[PDB]
Amino acid sequence: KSIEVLTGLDPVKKRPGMYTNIENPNHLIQEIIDNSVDEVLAGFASKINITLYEDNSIEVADDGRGMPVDIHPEHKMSGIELIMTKLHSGGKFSNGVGVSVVNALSTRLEAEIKRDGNVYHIVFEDGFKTKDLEIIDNVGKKNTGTKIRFWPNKKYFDDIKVNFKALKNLLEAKAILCKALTIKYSNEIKKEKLTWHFETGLKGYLDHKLPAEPFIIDNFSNGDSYLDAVFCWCESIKNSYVNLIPTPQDGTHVTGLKNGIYDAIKAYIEKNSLSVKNIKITANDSFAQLNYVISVKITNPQFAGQTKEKLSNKDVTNFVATAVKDLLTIWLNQNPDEARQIVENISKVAQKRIN
Numbered sequence: 001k002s003i004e005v006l007t008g009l010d011p012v013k014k015r016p017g018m019y020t021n022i023e024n025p026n027h028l029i030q031e032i033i034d035n036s037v038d039e040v041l042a043g044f045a046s047k048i049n050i051t052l053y054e055d056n057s058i059e060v061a062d063d064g065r066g067m068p069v070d071i072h073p074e075h076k077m078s079g080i081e082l083i084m085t086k087l088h089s090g091g092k093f094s095n096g097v098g099v100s101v102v103n104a105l106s107t108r109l110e111a112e113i114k115r116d117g118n119v120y121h122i123v124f125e126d127g128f129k130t131k132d133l134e135i136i137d138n139v140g141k142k143n144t145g146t147k148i149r150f151w152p153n154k155k156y157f158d159d160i161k162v163n164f165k166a167l168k169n170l171l172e173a174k175a176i177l178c179k180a181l182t183i184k185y186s187n188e189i190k191k192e193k194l195t196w197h198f199e200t201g202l203k204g205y206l207d208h209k210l211p212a213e214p215f216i217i218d219n220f221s222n223g224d225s226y227l228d229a230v231f232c233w234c235e236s237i238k239n240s241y242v243n244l245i246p247t248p249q250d251g252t253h254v255t256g257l258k259n260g261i262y263d264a265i266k267a268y269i270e271k272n273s274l275s276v277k278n279i280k281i282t283a284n285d286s287f288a289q290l291n292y293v294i295s296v297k298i299t300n301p302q303f304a305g306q307t308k309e310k311l312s313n314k315d316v317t318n319f320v321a322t323a324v325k326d327l328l329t330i331w332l333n334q335n336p337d338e339a340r341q342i343v344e345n346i347s348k349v350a351q352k353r354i355n
C-alpha cells in the first residue's frame with residue numbers, strides 16, 4: 001500500500017505475453033477463477049459455476065457477496081468499472097495481474113452482480129465500458145453473487161479454443177483443497193457437465209495416486225491461518241499450495257512440514273529406544289522418502305522475487321512446524337508398530353548418507 005499504481009490497459013494490449021499465457025484463453029479463465037476463489041477463502045462463496053459456450057465465451061459465477069459497485073470518491077466510477085478498466089499494482093518499494101487483463105484481451109465482457117437486492121449489469125468492449133452500470137432486475141437480499149462472461153480476442157491468442165482437459169484437471173485440483181467448495185462445469189460445445197465436491201477433501205488422494213493409511217491434518221488453524229496436509233513415506237507426489245494456487249518452488253510452508261516432521265521423529269527416537277539414538281539423523285533424512293500434499297490458507301501471502309511461486313512469510317514456517325510436530329507425535333504415540341518402521345527406514349537413509 002506504500003506505492004499504489006494505476007494505468008490504462010495499453011501496456012497489456014501491446015505485450016499480452018507479459019500478462020498471460022497466449023497459447024489459449026485458459027490463463028484468462030484462471031484470473032477469473034482466482035478472484036472467485038478469494039471470495040470462497042474469505043468464507044462468503046460456496047459455489048463456482050463455469051460455462052463454456054459455443055461462441056467460445058467463458059462464464060464464471062459465484063454466490064459470494066458480489067463485486068462492490070459503490071462510486072470511488074477519487075476515480076469517480078464504480079468498483080466494478082474501476083477494477084475492470086485499469087491495471088492495478090503496487091508494493092513497498094520499487095525495483096495477481098487482475099481481471100482487467102481479461103477485460104483488455106477480450107472483445108466483449110459482461111458482468112452481472114447481485115447485491116443489496118439488486119441485479120447490476122455492465123458491459124465492456126476491448127477493455128472500455130460501453131454500457132453503463134444499471135439495475136436491470138431485483139432479487140432477494142440474500143441472493144448474492146458475481147458472474148462474468150467474456151469473449152477472448154483472437155488477435156492476442158494462438159488459439160481461441162479452451163483446453164478443456166487442463167481446465168477440468170485444474171478445477172478438480174481446487175475442489176480437492178476446499179471441502180466447503182462445490183464447482184460445476186458445463187461445456188455446451190461438447191455437451192458435458194461435471195460436478196466436483198470433495199466432502200473429505202484430500203482423504204484418499206495419496207492412496208489413489210507408511211503409515212498404511214496416510215496421515216491427515218484436517219483444517220488446522222491459528223487465527224486467520226489454515227492448514228490442510230496429507231503425507232506418508234514410500235519407495236512420487238510432492239505438491240504444495242498457498243490459497244489454492246501451486247507453489248512449484250516450495251517455501252516457508254514446506255520448510256514448515258519438513259521441520260515439524262524432523263522434530264517429531266527426533267523427539268520420538270529420544271523418548272523410546274530402537275537402537276537408533278546414536279545415528280546422526282537430519283531433517284533431510286526424515287524428509288527424503290516423504291510423499292505429501294500441503295495446502296495453507298493465509299491472509300497476505302508474500303512470495304519470492306516478482307513471481308508467486310515460493311511462499312516467503314517468515315512466520316508460516318513455525319506455524320506449520322509446530323502443528324505437524326504435535327499432531328504427528330500424538331499419532332506416533334498410538335501407532336507403535338508403524339512408528340518403529342518409519343524410524344528404521346529413516347535411520348537407513350541416514351546411514352547410507354553417512355557411509
Ligand SMILES: CNc1cc(F)cc2c1[nH]c1nc(Oc3cnc(C)nc3)nc(N3C[C@H]4CCN[C@H]4C3)c12
Pocket residue numbers: 032033035036038039060061062064065066067068083099145146147148
Ligand atoms: C466469478 N466471480 C468473480 C469474478 C471477479 F472477477 C471478481 C469477483 C468475483 N466474485 C467476487 N466477489 C467479491 O466479493 C467481495 C465483496 N465485497 C468485498 C469488500 N470484497 C469482496 N469480490 C470480487 N472482487 C473485488 C476484488 C477483491 C478481490 N478480488 C476482486 C474482485 C469478486
